[PDB]
Design a protein around this nucleic acid. Structure first.
Lengths: 61, 48, 431, 445, 279, 28, 652
RNA sequence: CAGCGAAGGAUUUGGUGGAUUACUAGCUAAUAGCAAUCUA
């Protein structure tokens, strides 16, 4: 959900050379179109598929 | 007969003394004011 | 690096400067005669005047200290401070201190040298500035209280690391500690440079040569089971053997003989290295005890020689050099000794070199191989080159009586060599 | 002074104050253009004060024999093949594929012998089968395999005669009153020896046999003998083709082991000597090319429980001679004991003393000596014990010093119950109680 | 794996020469392929680390040339039992392949050098090396009668070479691994097959175009072709033999094997075929 | 205790080098 | 052939190829410009970071390159290119057809020697500009004067002269007057290298027999001679920080250090580079510094440093041996297998024929690291077998990485050449793992896979048997026996529910995985050589033996496309990350892209080396190919990530 | 003990180097100079 190093819990390994921690507080699926919203610290992250890409056929010959 | 010559060459080899870790540890006790030729034959007695 | 590390570096640089009274007391109480409470109250004039008395005593014993009375022990040196002149004046007085130390390394059994180098310890701070040369010079005296005293007051160099449990201790360092000290490679390079300066300025004395040779052969003995350490160790100790053979002292020459004989019996060296070693042995052979050790050394170095090529004729240059250092009576007499040295491969190479290079002294080779007994391959090669001598030159009574000896013992073998090359009726028709 | 002058620098004329680097090599503040040879000398002194002049250039230009030979050489030991005899204290021994790895053994491998000429290794054990393996480095395959039912085998030997060197028999035997003899023909024609020709009471088991060569000594006709170690002190010698009992040699005590020595006499004549040891330590030598009569009787110095004698350095029964003129006198004789002590005698001088002293008594492995074999050149002896695991040592000789780098703690020797040396390749086979022949190659050969 | 390290037939397939190890030393033996017309004596390589890297039957005192790994071509007559003549290059480099046309022997080196020797004169005629051919392990003389022009050299990638100019005149896409067989089939085609793949490909030596691909069903060890291109028998890693019958006709771009032969015993043990010969 | 074969942390230094651009002269 | 999907980006994993590199010095720092085939690469000598890569590939291989302050002079086939910051500033065409093969730069002059023993001098126009640009004259070394020109140097304070080192002679030219000032006496063996000493007017010559000559170029004599018997000398360098050491570099890979003052030999670094790839090809001291940079033809560039002396009074006689400092490297042999380590296209795993598994970074070349082969301890406590002389594992046939449980347990599963077990690796630790999965049927491993739960690894043996091990604990879980000839492809669903195996008997088996049933078996018309499972769309592609690519879905078990057109054996193929295309590469030296929606071939590239591996990134960023020659990984970027390409079929 | 087991095995520790963010070079008075020097 984040690669910002300005948030806290992002890196698992810290460079051997408070900050707002990263967390998702609520997840919900969309009731109409194949997506979900996640209330992170950066905002409401909205992840959705789209059918324009990903050739995924259904029993073609 | 080169195998026979090689066998007589390895047959004419005599038993020698090898250097150990502690073949020369007991010389410091008597390197005190002895002469260096007496040290040489004391070493040669260890080697032979 | 850290700030405490960088400050330890600046402390080690400023080790000798007294920046207050407490450091001056801790730094001036380091004496070699007195204890700390007397040594802290003494002056420079007091320790200078009795060190000048002791240098007059040391100079009437050995007259090479008078120039140190001219420069290092003069009265301008009472006020000469060490860490106030530049690097060039520092290197001048530090090779002055090195000259004094490797001159007075031999004298360390008599109290004038202790009271004289007391002034180098307290004026010029040579226990903490010129400390490697001090340890290397008095290394021989390690069972003695004078080495106990310099270990108590010394600041130990990083190469001398194993003596760090014998500083301020009541017991002397042991011989196994001395072998562990010498067993390093950087210490071996350091000590060989010290010996190079000793051999150069002609100060090698026999107690030093005994100690040095003992520790060297113990290093070789300790490393006798790892060939990579022996191979790291060969161009150090063979180089110091060459530099000890390249001097005039009979004692240091037979010290090098001892090092060479132990090293050649510890690992099988190359044939050409052994031949160049015997050339360096013979090229400066002037004494008599050196001649005794040199003959025994060349015999053992040829004994420890294996493979195809052990008993060739040694070449013309080295054979005539060995002739000019050792004639026939010397070789025959030494073989006639009842202690029976093992001179097999060397005597075989010697007689084959006589048959290729002398061609007049064949009665003597009959007498010496009548004296000592050889092996089957030795006498086979001897009679093969005598056969070739018969076929190149006309066969007189000395070669005939040699073949009578080789008929009177082991006639089947001379038949085997004639049948491998030639014929018995044809050879009897030859001679 | 100089080997060239170019005559162009003298008439060149450079500026100085145009670039900041050359702005420093003026000697005045009025110099602006200088001559070329002057300018070359200015920047020569400038180069000399950037890189200061070392001492190796002006110091010197090109009893020192040792220093010169050290400054040219980089290796300092004998190279590859100008050695011809083994270095002590450090072996050179690679591990090959385990010889019976192709076809596993169903028992402890009790005996093991190479062929005298062919690349064949015969293994055999208490599972009453004997297997021949064509050995090489990579793929030791199984030539053939013969399972004798009801006859567990304990000693198996390749015999190859001296007359035509074309027989190739295999003699094999165990705790039975018979001994089999397979004639190698590449069905299998084997015969069985089961008649002691009047001497069955003194030979109740054919376990400990050895095969050797014997000369008629009125003709120059050799034939193989098998030699059976019997109950009382008896060695029953019998013909290896007809099975006829030729002679018998009785020692006084508990016969424990024996070996065969040969010594040449003239062109085409040799003499066979049987060397048999009491349990107590006293050794008989029987001349048996004549009637089996004693010629020497001596005593082992020390040694109280004596299990195994061996000779080596010439033709043993395990390094056999293919041609009668290649028969050699054995130099070494090792008497290995129950405490693990192995006395070693040098028979170039210890045939005269009659109480001869050993050249060394090895003591490195501490339990009962059950194998000790000499390499065909006679430079290694192999002590081995079937009592504890990993009890094998290779002692170098004449120096009489055990090799200290092999075997290590990770050598899969196992419980060493047989050992064999190759006659040509320089190659050990070591069979353990798990049924595995492990194979090593000594890179000196 | 097989004990037989190297093996090759004579032309007409009447004798088989084979190098196997014998207790750490190589030995070279010759067997007749039909007894109705043992041979118990071998050439023994006397060094433990000298070994044969290639071998070729000459065609009339009959002999083998054994390319060793010390820069030597031994020439060994088989009725007698000695190496009759020892060709040597100036180096110690192992030699990767040899060939001959008539009396003219050619060989390749591990330093990617080409050497030419004359069997009638026992002399090193030529020594050269060409650019961008740097891992060579096969050569094959393209036959044009007594003219020995056009070598054909492989390094994973076959290259046709004119020897008068000492230069490369064609470049064939080889394989992804070193070429292990490289043999001339007709006067316009050559077959090649690499190490550890089951695909031969036949190239047109005049254009560079691959005519066809031949697909074994196991990794190919050796091949033999009948002398008129009508059949190709390859022998594979699993000990099987596969015969492509008439591979040079119109299974159009890649052809499978027509016949497959394997040998089993009476038990069920499958013995492996190595090195067959077809005519 | 044996001698201490530890490695220092190496930093480069400022070196002067002769550049050869002054080794070329033009004629009038 | 130019493409319309993928355009070439870089060839990663390359550090050197054994052209002698050049060093250059900006201010008080140093850079190291090494040739990698047809590009050079500039490295920061204080940390060996890749500063610059040359902007365009030269039309042939760079053969001699030098570096003054800001500029890099690279000589390839005919001409000399003058480069600043990678971007080429000038191109000097020589008037010959001979290949330029040496060059020096001093003053206003650039001097370039060709291989017909002619030398081309180029001059600046006005002495304030940056590089020599105009033609000046031509010099010739004929057969009377000297042999083949073996080096071309300018030793300092020599006013517009040039030391030309031929194979037997040393000539000295005045390059303004075009004259031959001085020709030395001959040398009794062929000299191979030259280096100017920091001593004034002294050059150092290195011969093809083992000796270093110290020629004094003004006296005409030789000062001293150093003999290193049976060693061909390939490099010479001098120490310039108040310690007079020389470093010679020997083509059996050795770096020997000499003291010139006291004439001893300090140390020998043996096997510093491989002899088979050229030995030590260029070794040079960074001047004023005790660090020496070596480089060899085995795609490796190292630095060695001299620590200060351990004796506090002697110093000059107790010289501590040179120790190793940083180094960069890549594969020394061309890579045999390729995979992407993660979905971000950051790291990629890469295995070569020199038996090493590297992990190369696509973002920053310092992060490239060799995966270590230091084995763990045995689990029970018994001994592990193997040789004492440790060598690398047999070269890698296949691998499969699935970083779902990464850092948790073993993560990569790999299959080696002609050995019957598949090792595991951990990409997080960058090291081998604790488990080697056996095949349990005495057959070599022909394929590996692992599930995307990360729990299961799949081994496919050459006797046709799939074994399913657990990646965490390393033990056999299941064993399917369907095929009888070698199993060349295993894969599994993204939901661990149906697995699909393909063998070279030409049957694709479809198994349920949770239940151990088979769902079906489909017999194709050729032996199958390789499978790739596109896991989101559940479509897997097979490279058949009849040179077609059969695209078949696993849900309904039908052949749904069949792509024809390859002329030889298909070496590799891979799906697009959206699963729309499939890019294949085959032994007719071609790479094709197929739009499996329409079923036709979108694009084709004729590439001179045969591409042995093709992998897409798991995003649509990059294609990574791997060819027969070249130690690196060729990297392409799809232009269809920025534009849209027409799915209209090509031909010819 | 069995088992594992290639010219040895195990444990502990000091130092250094490379990564730990995605690779466009050093210095300065900076459209350029220097890097052998900024100063007359």
């Amino acid at each position: 959900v984040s690669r910002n190093m300005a948030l806290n819990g992002t890196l698992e390994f810290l460079n051997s050379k408070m900050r707002p921690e990263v967390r998702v507080t609520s997840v919900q699926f969309s009731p109409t179109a194949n997506a979900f919203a996640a209330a992170s610290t950066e905002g409401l992250l909205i992840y959705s598929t789209n059918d324009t890409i990903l050739f995924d056929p259904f029993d073609l010959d | 007969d080169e195998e026979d010559i090689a066998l007589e060459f390895i047959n004419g080899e005599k038993k020698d003394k090898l250097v150990n870790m502690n073949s020369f540890t007991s010389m410091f006790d008597n390197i005190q004011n002895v002469q260096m030729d007496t040290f040489f034959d004391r070493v040669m007695k260890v080697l032979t | 690096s850290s700030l405490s590390d960088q400050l330890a570096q600046v402390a080690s640089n400023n080790a000798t400067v007294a920046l207050d009274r407490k450091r001056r007391q801790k730094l001036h109480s380091a004496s070699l005669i007195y204890n700390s409470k007397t040594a802290a109250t003494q002056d420079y004039d007091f320790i200078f005047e009795n060190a000048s008395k002791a240098l007059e005593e040391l100079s009437q014993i050995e007259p090479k200290f008078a120039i140190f009375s001219r420069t290092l022990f003069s009265e301008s040196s009472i006020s000469l401070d060490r860490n106030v002149q530049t690097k060039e004046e520092i290197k001048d007085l530090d090779n002055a201190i090195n000259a004094y130390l490797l001159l007075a390394s031999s004298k360390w059994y008599l109290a004038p040298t202790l009271h004289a180098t007391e002034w180098l310890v307290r004026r010029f701070q040579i226990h903490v500035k010129n400390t490697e040369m001090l340890l290397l010079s008095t290394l021989n005296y390690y069972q003695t209280p004078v080495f106990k005293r310099i270990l108590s007051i010394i600041k130990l160099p990083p190469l001398f690391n194993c003596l760090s449990n014998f500083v301020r201790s009541e017991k002397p360092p042991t011989a196994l500690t001395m072998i562990k000290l010498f067993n390093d490679m950087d210490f071996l390079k350091l000590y060989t440079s010290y010996l190079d300066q000793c051999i150069k300025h002609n100060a090698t004395y026999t107690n030093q040569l005994l100690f040095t040779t003992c520790c060297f052969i113990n290093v070789v003995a300790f490393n006798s089971n790892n060939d990579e350490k022996l191979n790291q160790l060969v161009p150090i100790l063979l180089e110091i053997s060459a530099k000890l053979l390249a001097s005039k002292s009979k004692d240091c020459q037979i010290a090098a003989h001892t090092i060479l004989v132990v090293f050649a019996t510890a690992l099988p060296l190359k044939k050409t290295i052994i031949l160049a070693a015997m050339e360096t042995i013979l090229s400066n052979l002037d004494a008599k005890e050196a001649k005794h050790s040199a003959l025994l050394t060349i015999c053992k170095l040829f004994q420890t020689l294996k493979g195809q090529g052990n008993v060739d004729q040694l070449p013309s240059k080295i054979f005539k050099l060995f002739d000019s250092k050792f004639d026939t009576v010397s070789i025959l007499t030494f073989l006639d000794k009842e202690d029976k040295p093992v001179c097999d491969k060397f005597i075989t190479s010697y007689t084959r070199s006589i048959a290729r290079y002398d061609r007049s002294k064949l009665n003597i080779i009959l007498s010496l191989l009548k004296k000592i007994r050889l092996e089957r391959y030795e006498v086979r090669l001897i009679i093969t080159d005598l056969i070739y001598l018969s076929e190149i030159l006309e066969d007189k009574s000395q070669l005939v009586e040699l073949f009578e000896y080789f008929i009177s013992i082991n006639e089947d073998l001379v038949l085997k060599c004639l049948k491998s090359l030639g014929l018995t009726g044809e050879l009897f028709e030859i001679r | 002074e100089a080997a060239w002058i170019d005559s162009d620098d003298e008439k060149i004329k450079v500026p100085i104050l145009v670039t900041n680097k050359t702005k420093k090599l003026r000697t005045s503040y009025n110099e602006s253009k200088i001559n070329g040879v002057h300018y070359i000398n200015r920047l020569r002194s400038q180069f000399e004060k950037i890189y200061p002049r070392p001492k190796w250039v002006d110091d010197e230009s090109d009893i020192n024999a040792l220093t010169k030979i050290l400054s040219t050489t980089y290796n300092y030991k004998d190279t590859l093949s100008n050695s011809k005899l083994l270095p002590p204290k450090k072996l050179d021994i690679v591990r090959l594929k385990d010889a019976n790895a192709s076809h596993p053994s169903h028992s402890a491998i009790q005996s093991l012998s190479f062929h005298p000429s062919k690349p064949l290794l015969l293994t055999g054990g208490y599972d009453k089968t004997l297997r021949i393996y064509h050995i090489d480095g990579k793929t030791n395959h199984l030539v053939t395999s013969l399972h004798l039912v009801g006859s567990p085998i304990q000693t198996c030997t390749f015999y190859t005669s001296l007359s035509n060197q074309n027989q190739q028999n295999i003699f094999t035997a165990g705790r039975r009153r018979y001994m089999h003899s397979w004639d190698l023909s590449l069905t299998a024609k084997i015969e069985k020896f089961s008649r002691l020709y009047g001497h069955e009471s003194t030979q109740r088991s054919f376990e400990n046999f050895k095969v050797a060569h014997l000369q008629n000594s009125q003709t120059n006709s050799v034939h193989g003998i098998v030699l059976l170690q019997g109950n009382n002190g008896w060695i029953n010698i019998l013909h290896s083709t007809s099975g006829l009992w030729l002679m018998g040699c009785k020692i006084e005590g508990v016969i424990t082991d024996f070996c065969i020595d040969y010594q040449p006499i003239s062109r085409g004549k040799f003499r066979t000597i049987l060397i048999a040891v009491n349990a107590y330590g006293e050794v008989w030598e029987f001349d048996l090319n004549k009637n089996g009569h004693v010629i020497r009787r001596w005593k082992d110095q020390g040694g109280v429980g004596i299990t195994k004698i061996q000779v080596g350095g010439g033709t043993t029964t395990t390094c056999p001679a293919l041609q009668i003129s290649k028969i050699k006198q054995n130099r070494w004789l090792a008497v290995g004991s129950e405490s693990g002590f192995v006395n070693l005698y040098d028979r170039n001088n210890a045939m005269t003393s009659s109480t001869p002293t050993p050249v060394a008594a090895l003591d490195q492995l501490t339990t009962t000596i059950s194998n000790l074999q000499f390499s065909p050149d006679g430079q290694i002896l192999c002590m081995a014990s079937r009592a504890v695991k990993d009890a094998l040592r290779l002692v170098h000789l004449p120096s009489c010093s055990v090799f200290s780098n092999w075997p290590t703690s990770g050598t899969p020797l196992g419980k060493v119950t047989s050992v064999a040396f190759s006659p040509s390749g320089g190659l050990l086979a070591v069979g353990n109680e798990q049924g595995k022949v492990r194979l090593w190659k000594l890179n000196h050969y | 794996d097989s004990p037989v390290l190297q093996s090759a037939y004579d032309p007409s397939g009447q004798y088989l020469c084979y190098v196997t190890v014998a207790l750490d030393k190589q030995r070279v033996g010759v067997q007749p392929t039909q007894r109705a017309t043992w041979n118990e004596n071998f050439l023994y390589l006397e060094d433990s680390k000298l070994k044969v890297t290639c071998l070729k039957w000459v065609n009339d005192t009959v002999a083998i040339i054994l390319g060793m790994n010390n820069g030597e071509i031994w020439l060994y007559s088989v009725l007698a039992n000695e190496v009759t003549y020892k060709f040597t290059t100036g180096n110690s480099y192992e030699i990767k392949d040899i060939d001959l046309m008539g009396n003219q022997l050619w060989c390749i080196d591990s330093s990617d050098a080409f050497y030419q020797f004359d069997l009638l004169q026992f002399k090193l005629l030529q020594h050269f090396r060409i650019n961008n051919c740097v891992q060579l392990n096969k050569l094959t003389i393209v036959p044009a009668g007594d003219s020995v022009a056009q070598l054909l050299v492989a390094s994973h990638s076959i290259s046709l070479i004119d020897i008068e100019e000492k230069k490369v005149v064609m470049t064939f896409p080889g394989h992804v691994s070193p070429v292990s067989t490289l043999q001339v089939i007709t006067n316009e085609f050559f077959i090649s097959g690499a190490e550890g793949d089951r695909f031969l490909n036949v190239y047109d030596i005049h254009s560079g175009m691959t005519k066809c691909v031949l697909v074994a069903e196991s990794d190919i060890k050796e091949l033999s072709h009948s002398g008129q291109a009508d059949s190709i028998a390859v022998t594979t890693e699993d000990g099987s033999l596969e015969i492509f019958v008439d591979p040079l006709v119109s299974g159009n771009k890649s052809k499978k094997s027509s016949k497959k032969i394997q040998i089993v015993s009476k038990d069920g043990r499958k013995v492996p075929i190595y090195n067959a010969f077809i005519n | 205790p044996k001698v201490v074969r530890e490695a220092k942390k190496v930093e480069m230094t400022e070196a002067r080098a002769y550049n050869a651009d002054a080794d070329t002269a033009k004629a009038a | 052939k130019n493409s319309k999907i993928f355009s070439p980006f870089r060839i990663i994993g390359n550090v050197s190829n054994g052209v002698p590199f050049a060093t250059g010095t900006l201010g008080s720092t140093f850079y190291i410009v090494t040739c990698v085939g047809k590009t050079f690469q500039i490295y920061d000598a204080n940390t060996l970071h890749l500063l610059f890569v040359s902007e365009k590939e030269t039309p042939s291989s760079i053969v001699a390159l030098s570096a003054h302050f800001h500029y890099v002079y690279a000589a390839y086939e005919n001409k000399v290119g003058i480069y600043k910051r990678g971007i080429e500033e000038h191109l000097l065409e020589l008037e010959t057809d001979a290949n330029v093969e040496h060059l020096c730069i001093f003053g206003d002059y650039l001097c370039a020697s060709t291989d017909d023993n002619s030398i081309f001098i180029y001059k600046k126009s006005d002495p304030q500009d940056k590089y020599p640009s105009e033609f000046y004259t031509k010099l010739t070394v004929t057969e009377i004067q000297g042999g083949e020109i073996v080096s071309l140097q300018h030793l300092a304070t020599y006013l517009n002269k040039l030391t030309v080192v031929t194979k037997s002679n040393v000539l000295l030219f005045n390059v303004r007057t075009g004259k031959l000032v001085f020709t030395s006496n001959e040398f009794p063996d062929q000299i191979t290298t030259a280096e100017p000493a920091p001593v004034l007017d002294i050059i150092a010559l290195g011969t093809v027999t083992g000796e270093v000559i110290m020629f004094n170029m003004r006296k005409g004599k030789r000062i001293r001679t150093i003999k290193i018997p049976q060693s061909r000398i390939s490099s010479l360098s001098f120490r310039t920080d108040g310690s007079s050491h020389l470093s010679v570099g020997t083509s059996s890979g050795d770096l020997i250090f000499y003291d010139l003052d006291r004439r001893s030999r300090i140390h020998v670094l043996k096997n510093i580079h491989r002899e088979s790839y050229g030995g030590v090809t260029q070794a040079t001291f960074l001047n004023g510094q005790p660090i020496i940079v070596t480089s060899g033809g085995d795609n490796s560039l190292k630095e060695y440093v001299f620590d200060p002396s351990l004796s506090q009074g002697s110093g000059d006689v107790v010289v501590q041996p040179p120790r190793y400092l940083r180094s960069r490297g890549g594969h020394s042999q061309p890579p045999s297998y390729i995979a992407f380590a993660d979905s971000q296209s950051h790291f990629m795993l890469s295995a070569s024929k020199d038996r090493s598994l590297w992990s190369f970074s696509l973002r920053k070349d310092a992060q490239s690291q060799e995966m270590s082969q230091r084995l763990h301890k045995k689990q029970d406590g018994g001994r592990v077998g193997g040789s004492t002389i440790k060598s690398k594992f047999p070269e890698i046939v296949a691998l499969a990485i699935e970083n779902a449980r990464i850092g948790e347990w073993e993560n990569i599963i790999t299959a080696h050449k002609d050995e019957k077990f598949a090792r595991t690796w951990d990409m997080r630790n960058k090291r081998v793992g604790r488990w080697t999965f056996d095949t349990t049927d005495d057959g070599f491993v022909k394929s590996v896979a692992m599930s995307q739960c990360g729990n299961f690894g799949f081994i496919g043996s050459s006797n046709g048997s799939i074994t399913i091990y657990n990646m965490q604990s390393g033990i056999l879980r299941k064993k399917y026996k369907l095929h009888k000839r070698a199993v060349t492809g295993i894969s599994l669903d993204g939901m661990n529910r149906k697995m699909v195996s393909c063998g070279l008997d030409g049957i694709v088996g479809f198994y349920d995985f949770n239940k151990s049933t088979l769902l079906g078996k489909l017999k194709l018309d050729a032996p199958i050589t390789a499978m790739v499972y596109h896991r989101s769309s559940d479509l897997f592609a097979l490279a058949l033996d009849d040179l077609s690519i059969v695209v078949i879905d696993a849900v309904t078990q039908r052949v749904v496309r069949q792509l024809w057109g390859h002329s030889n054996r298909i070496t590799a193929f891979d799906f697009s990350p959206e699963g729309r295309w499939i890019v294949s590469a085959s032994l007719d030296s071609t790479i094709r892209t197929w739009d499996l929606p329409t079923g036709g071939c979108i694009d084709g590239i004729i590439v001179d080396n045969v591409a042995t591996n093709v992998k897409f990134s798991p995003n649509g960023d990059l294609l990574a190919t791997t060819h027969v020659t070249g130690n690196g990984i060729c990297i392409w970027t799809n232009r269809a990530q920025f534009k849209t390409v027409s799915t209209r079929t090509i031909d010819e």
